[model samples]
Target: TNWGSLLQDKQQLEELARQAVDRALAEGVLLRTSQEPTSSEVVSYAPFTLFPSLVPSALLEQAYAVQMDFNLLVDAVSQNAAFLEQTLSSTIKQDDFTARLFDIHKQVLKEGIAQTVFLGLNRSDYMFQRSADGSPALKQIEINTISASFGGLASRTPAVHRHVLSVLSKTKEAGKILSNNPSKGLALGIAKAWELYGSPNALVLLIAQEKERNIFDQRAIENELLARNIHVIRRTFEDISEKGSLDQDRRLFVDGQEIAVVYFRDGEMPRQYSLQNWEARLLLERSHAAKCPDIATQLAGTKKVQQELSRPGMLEMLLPGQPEAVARLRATFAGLYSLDVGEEGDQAIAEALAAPSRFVLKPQRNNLYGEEMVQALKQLKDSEERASYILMEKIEPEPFENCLLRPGSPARVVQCISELGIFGVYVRQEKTLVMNKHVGHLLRTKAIGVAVLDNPYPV
Candidate 1:
């Protein structure tokens, strides 16, 4: 962790940075592009920190330990339709996207879920904030059940940093970077469901975005499954809607092939959907093929549901009698305030408007922060959209100096902060717990602002 060792040799540091870039590019840490008169220059090494970031060994381990506990909490929440329904009602009323999802969930429930085998491939993101006594404390940012990206690309980061350190004098720090490969585990989760589905002829359909610049990241998992003799194919919303169908048994068929299981990697943004796209999603939800996040599970990831679960007795209500699980999950909880109408909502909004420094006026959707929070809160306060937002206390991530490297840009040392995300996967069949695991982790470092990938030096 000696900053001086890294800074002492200007020429040597620059040389090592070049090596890191080449190494990452050579080792599949690349952004993909195509070429067939169409194009072929999609070759760019992913943006990353030249050196691994120092994380407290204890806090790092604690994040991993709590990952499975988070898995359990998320599974419980997803399975509880009543909880999801009650929690998201207000947000669903205001947010069209959430309402569309909730409507699908309701329809599926009313007709009964066709697939009992449920797969949840998720990630829980965290940041270290100084606790009351100035000790590093773990605080959760969110639990992502769908669109939890970077498992494949991040698996390629550990060695890139390890090599950068090998050229420096921090052999010890280099040695401690735990080797991680969440890609294999992510594919394994899907493979597990595919096996349970008991159809050798069925395909594992990967629902990808139309403009997937991270094709290589996704390809890592796709290739892994193919290596295991599991058939995998990638498709977009248009492809699915045009070729998708369901037989009398409710088994899903797309492009004349039976789909054993589906891993949803896109389809959240409002711009991505059309009437036909919505129909495709409804078809996927109602099919016999197991979805990584079936309609209910997807809704379980909403910010409104997240805030609701942060309540005192909610976890106990969902998990019941497991005091240890409740305690473990609650320890990482930060301040989450609901903006639903009442004295509570009015008071919190007023307080937040006056003192914007303490909390983030977060909308009940997938998003982030700024000083314009007061204006945002004021606008939503006077409008009928107040219930569509919530308040979350901001975490002050301790900063450090590190060099960030990106394609077409020179490496420069700058103040940075980091967030840790642990990948988790699980499978359930007819109320039976089949597999639950903390697969691996990723470090997302920001140079005060721009995000970059990083390796974790457990110290």
Candidate 2:
């Protein structure tokens, strides 16, 4: 089938889309945006492809199949303190954000790990790469350990896509749209940790951003927890700084209520918080509450760590004696090169300079290059400041034509690409594996061709 070739009945398709939007609204697939200090909430259809994009079943299954291994890999890397220290040292030295986090991790280590029950909730994102004359192969983009978004909202998209496909008389395709509920899976992970904490009265504390436009998505998980009879409370940095504390036993308490779990949905960057927030974060780190991702785990997901892990034998080193797990986790990596100051770093810079278009020069956090890359590769070499970034082979997926549905935007067939995110949940209590499961997934489709750079600090 020549997909997106020609729409014979344009008016009919528009009507179908309109009806589909109505169905989406009815089905609660709305994204909320707010005006005036995030008070006046306006709900709109989540920007999505009007029709489902094509995906190879084998590749899709392949992504799902290896997710557990990724889970274990992330958990293992987090547990390996030496490796985390070694892997992130360069970045920590140069990047203040990394330094702040490293300080917290060090404090936690010195005080000793407060909680025996560990919770790891992560989303491993991937894109399919089409070879010159072969199948679309799945390649990992990144693993998000802390504050992975959209899991709560992704579960709702399939129904809307299924409805849209059926309207187009493609019942077969509609039937194939698999059901997913990451909101439930993620909450279940939190619930497991809360249970292991042995505090029935202790509530799960959700740390959120100052102005959250995506309240509905987060609310899904909250509502899910409610259904499971788990109590939840939302707080911010100010709230934590002012009211949160730990008792002598290291049990976290806020406003006299015990906190069993700290499910963080914010705090990804240094600039996002004040000194008070940082102090509060350190306070939380020293508490006996189960963190969805402890400090070390978040460090494990850093670009520096990801690049280091891409080196030969790193996975095997982290996860010893697990050959199959090694191979499974290893298969998804695209070429990742260190920007840490060394001969290897110089070589990577040279290669990237030679072909700037072939790679993305990501900082310890992440992102890419057009003018920024060519400039960074050239100007940012002499200083060990290059340690702040890593080079990666860009996995550009072949785009397909799909109609995008958005507010006030003309619905025309446009070239688009989709990214798949697999959500995984793991829980452990002092080396006893409580739960390590491939929970659910998210699919995000966007119209290609968009980049506008504004890097203030030159490296």
Candidate 3:
């Protein structure tokens, strides 16, 4: 496990890192332009580290094993519409964005669902917490239901890292960089749903952002679908207003093309919306087109819902008659407390105020805080916005030494930790389960004091 020899060869290691960067760009791993929309340049370099983060084999496998059951839990929760509506009711009232989404769900319900099947492409993020015995165990961070990214580009990083290892004469350890191809698995899930849509001529709709910089990751999915003879059309919410419509039978159509599936890569945030965007979201929700995550499923992924799931007996209600499965899921939970109005909420607020360093206060909407931890707590207590956030215990991962190479800096070894994200794709038809599988994984590393970054490739 020693990297001393590799670390000593600065010239050779830099060459290998440069080689990896070239390979990533040539292989369509490059991100889209972050420039003006009218610019002719189509691709731009994404930020990345030069080397893959080292991880324990056992920890990686543990993440892979739990994904299917995690998918099941998410699906079960999504289907229990009443529970989500009731659970998120307070947050919905306090947050205008959540309220609008809830209104769309209500409107869809009144008109009834045109498409009975739902598709969920999710990513569950985690960090490793060291046990008293010194072994690391996975701890839940967050679950992204709306636009879980990196599946495509992440599928290619192991090869890049393995190649770097081979160049360093560490061929013996290169095999440990496990083979992962999330793009293919994700495409399979989309293609399966497209087939179930019962129309060979219909197009797969990719609802995307107007100025997307990380589009190559999405194009990887589109390319995989094209290999299976599935045609994909990319459009923005604004475009949806210009060309989208629902047929008499509730089928979705964009510019006269029937849509088999509406895969969302945007619209997660409220700022992405215009007045027309809201209309477009509702139009798509009321259509017969299958949504990757319908409005209800999106609601189920909010932080409030995550906090509620951590409550005792909540998992039991979600997975009735399945205590063993519930236990396994519950084992990964770190301390989570509600900020809703009640006795428990009051006590949670008190605890966080008393020892602000021990907890993180996250709003249902975004990150906002004060200079001192206690000052943040005071703000929360003084404002009615207190009901909009949830408190979670901070998870400290054991740090390890690793080499990092940013674009402008020389490669250097520093203390760092990694986060693991396991992607899960689930397909369902009404109340019947059709396909559920653990697709692949993404690992992101950050130097202990550095700002957290998202580009998956090593620089």
Candidate 4:
């Protein structure tokens, strides 16, 4: 499988890539014009590779297989409200945004359960690590429960890449892109939840940002829902603040329309919230409207929890009877360490500072580094805020040569490595699992050399 030699026709590939770009535009696979006001009058092109990165089929199959188990694991974690409240207790104390979310969960608990069913749409990110024996193994990066993006655009990319492969006369390789239609699968998940919502007149709500550049991706899901005769309404947090309310039975209503589901595409960060927005979030959480992720589920995705899961005995505690599933998950984890105050925390800080290259210092919010890389770890270790951060083993992915396409640049070969994200859509009614499956996948690649520093793709 010499992909490099197979894709050698630069002129032909470039022409086909340009056609693919046009096709993507015509098909509405684009970011909003506001993101790049000077780029064009309509919409700007999304950053993508000219060719699909060649991934080992076996690795992809493993990813797909693990997702159902992953979904079950996340669901188990989220459903254990006591565990999240205890694990994230310190994080809630340090971060105002997380604290507010925790307060909402507490308030919901006091009021009693309004909705029994919950829907969780997640994307687990991974990178391939080369072993000492030259074999590549998939390593877990992170699991995104809130606003797991690119499913719509990702569904379209394989088609675009396949078309380019066909144009280059690599027909056999073109067939290997796999029939990935995540947009449809994700929509079906939403639609299934809506049906279970049991409200004939209720509308599906998409809580989005006011100036969203990724509207088309959201729109793709909305369009799919529409095809199934389901109506959807898009509104921001501000709009919810003004128009949303909860009735006596704790059902949610926005602009007089009953909402069957609240699918969030915004409000993950602190900057995205105001007092009104916080009030709006509490209102939604307290209501009977099934949230894509309730406050507890959102808290389950924090870095602290991820770090805790990697610790010895944590998985056994979380999944009591499932040794095989626990082993599968543990196999994918790179070392993760807590920065919380303790003897173990102190050791983790000392180790990270001693050899900074071996670890990545990650705070719950922003990533930071210093002129002397070890200096950052020293500062973190000395600060009370260190509890908000975690240390993780940096994954060294095996790089391969590939050509990337940008808006106005010629496709050129560079050493690049990719991250694969498998999308999982799960539905649950209290403790009973209704639906859980791996729906689709997304692949993102960046050049490995200095050229990557100047590259404009959204990594």
Best by TM-score: 1
Model 3 lDDT per residue over 90-140, tens place: 888788888888899989888888997689899988899877798888888
Model 2: per-residue lDDT, tens digit, 345-404?
889889888888889988884376766898878877887688888889988899876777
Report the alpha-carbon TM-score of model 4 versus the true structure.
Answer: 0.93
Question: lDDT for every model?
Answer: 0.84, 0.81, 0.79, 0.79
Which digits, one per residue and each the tens of the lDDT, describe model 1 over residues 332-410?
9999998887878888788887787778876665334555887777777766687788898888888998888877677
For model 2 the TM-score comes to: 0.94
Q: Positional deviation of 386 in candidate 2, in angstroms?
A: 0.5
The clash count of every prediction, one per candidate, is 5, 0, 5, 0
lDDT of 4 by residue, 169-275 (tens): 78887776677777888888888889888998999999988677778788888989999999999998889999998899988998899999889988778889989
Cα lDDT of candidate 3 equals: 0.79
**Off by more than 4 A, model 4:** 1-3, 6-16, 33-41, 369-373, 449-459
Off by over 4 Å in 3: 9-13, 36-42, 366-373, 405-410, 449-459
What would you estimate as the lDDT of candidate 4?
0.79
- TM-score, every prediction: 0.96, 0.94, 0.93, 0.93
Ranking by lDDT: 1, 2, 3, 4
Candidate that scores best on lDDT: 1
Compute the lDDT of residue 160 as modeled in candidate 3: 66
